Design an enzyme around this catalytic site. Structure first.
Site, short mmCIF file in Angstrom:
data_model
loop_
_atom_site.label_atom_id
_atom_site.label_comp_id
_atom_site.label_asym_id
_atom_site.label_seq_id
_atom_site.Cartn_x
_atom_site.Cartn_y
_atom_site.Cartn_z
N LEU A 16 0.83 -1.21 0.00
CA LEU A 16 0.00 0.00 0.00
C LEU A 16 0.86 1.26 0.00
CD1 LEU A 16 -2.55 -0.95 2.81
CD2 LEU A 16 -2.94 -1.12 0.34
N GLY A 17 1.96 1.22 0.75
CA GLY A 17 2.91 2.33 0.83
C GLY A 17 4.30 1.87 1.22
N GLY A 19 8.59 3.50 2.66
CA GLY A 19 9.46 4.58 3.13
C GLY A 19 10.76 4.06 3.71
N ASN A 20 11.33 4.84 4.63
CA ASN A 20 12.57 4.46 5.32
C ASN A 20 12.32 3.32 6.30
OD1 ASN A 20 13.07 7.88 5.20
ND2 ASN A 20 14.56 6.48 4.27
N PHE A 21 11.22 3.43 7.05
CA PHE A 21 10.74 2.38 7.96
C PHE A 21 10.64 0.99 7.30
CE2 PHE A 21 6.31 2.01 6.55
CZ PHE A 21 6.08 3.23 5.93
N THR A 23 7.46 -0.97 4.77
CA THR A 23 6.24 -0.95 3.95
C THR A 23 4.96 -1.01 4.77
OG1 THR A 23 6.20 -3.37 3.67
CG2 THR A 23 7.42 -2.09 2.03
N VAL A 24 3.87 -0.59 4.13
CA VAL A 24 2.51 -0.75 4.66
C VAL A 24 1.81 -1.72 3.72
CG1 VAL A 24 0.32 0.39 5.21
CG2 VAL A 24 2.49 1.60 5.56
N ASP A 127 3.77 15.68 11.73
CA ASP A 127 3.80 15.23 10.33
C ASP A 127 2.41 15.31 9.73
OD1 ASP A 127 4.96 14.37 7.92
OD2 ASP A 127 5.45 12.36 8.62
#
Ligand SMILES: Cn1cc(-c2nc(N[C@@H]3CCCC[C@@H]3N)c(F)c3c2C(=O)NC3)cn1
Length: 272
Positions: A16-17, A19-21, A23-24, A127
């Protein structure tokens, strides 16, 4: 307490998404009786950040904030949350340009109600952007992505950052940039930018500009112009959110009431 059973969780492959962290991803959690569709954030410093994010979410209880289901340690650390099927507000409006003014006002008002609660709870989001407002339906928004959020100390109205991290500078108030100080008032500045994004159908703010050029613009007293078709009353509110002096900038109680009253005015007008 809030530790889930990996056996009861089924993850889907498609992301779904990201980033640095990490995934979603979409998942399903076998509840009490029903199966619940969920959104799952999947990943030393990141572990503590995810736990901290989970710890913030655990404390919040509001219809306009994404609820945490729980956490799970399996192949990776996972943060299981409610699913918002229509996804990020910015992407939704980019793909749905037919969405009406009244509908946008409704959704930003729901964000203001969530933020009013967050302010009353003495948490700062840090954020608050259209990418972090998720749509359950076309008429139901929730605030998401609490990875930068902080519980304020009992004796202070702001969080003081030690170092300039990887920050979404185009959403940050002058006092965040200049003094590293984050309060509910700084979230109000961010909410103005979020409103601008929403009425610009998910366009990026300060397009073509570096962070340092945004700083210079703001110090000249300049602000982003009124988006095409944006009601004057809503642009006035954006500009009030972008009040330079933190003390004269309104809080979310004042912002939520302005939005509520204008929304009911538009609801009346559309009946007429
Ligand atoms: C259909 N759909 C749901 C989500 C979603 N995304 C989240 N984070 C993303 C991180 C990358 C930038 C865009 C988001 N901010 C999130 F935290 C939650 C979801 C979700 O449904 N519940 C929680 C995304 N698409």
């Amino acid at each position: 307490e809030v530790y889930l059973d990996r056996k009861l969780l089924t993850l889907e492959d498609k992301e779904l998404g990201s980033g640095n962290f990490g995934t979603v991803k979409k998942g399903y959690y076998q509840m009490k009786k029903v199966v619940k569709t969920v959104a799952v954030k999947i990943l030393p410093a990141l572990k503590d950040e995810l736990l901290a994010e989970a710890n913030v979410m655990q404390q919040l209880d509001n219809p306009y904030i994404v609820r945490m289901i729980g956490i799970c340690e399996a192949e990776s650390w996972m943060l299981v949350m409610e699913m918002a099927e229509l996804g990020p507000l910015n992407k939704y409006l980019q793909q749905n340009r037919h969405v009406k003014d009244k509908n946008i006002i409704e959704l930003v008002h729901q964000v203001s109600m969530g933020m009013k609660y967050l302010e009353e709870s003495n948490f700062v989001h840090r954020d608050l952007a259209a990418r972090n407002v998720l749509l359950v339906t076309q008429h139901y928004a929730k605030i998401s992505d609490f990875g930068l959020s902080k519980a304020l100390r009992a004796d202070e109205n702001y969080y003081k950052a030690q170092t300039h991290g990887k920050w979404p500078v185009k959403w940050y108030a002058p006092e965040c940039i200049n003094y590293y100080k984050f309060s509910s008032k700084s979230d109000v500045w961010s909410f103005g930018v979020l409103m601008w994004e929403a009425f610009s159908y998910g366009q990026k703010p300060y397009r073509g500009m570096k962070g340092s050029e945004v700083t210079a613009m703001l110090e000249k007293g300049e602000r982003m112009g009124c988006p095409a078709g944006c009601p004057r009353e809503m642009y006035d509110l954006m500009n009030l959110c972008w009040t330079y002096d933190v003390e004269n900038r309104p809080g979310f109680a004042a912002v939520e009431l302005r939005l509520r009253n204008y929304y009911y005015d538009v609801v009346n007008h559309h009946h007429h």
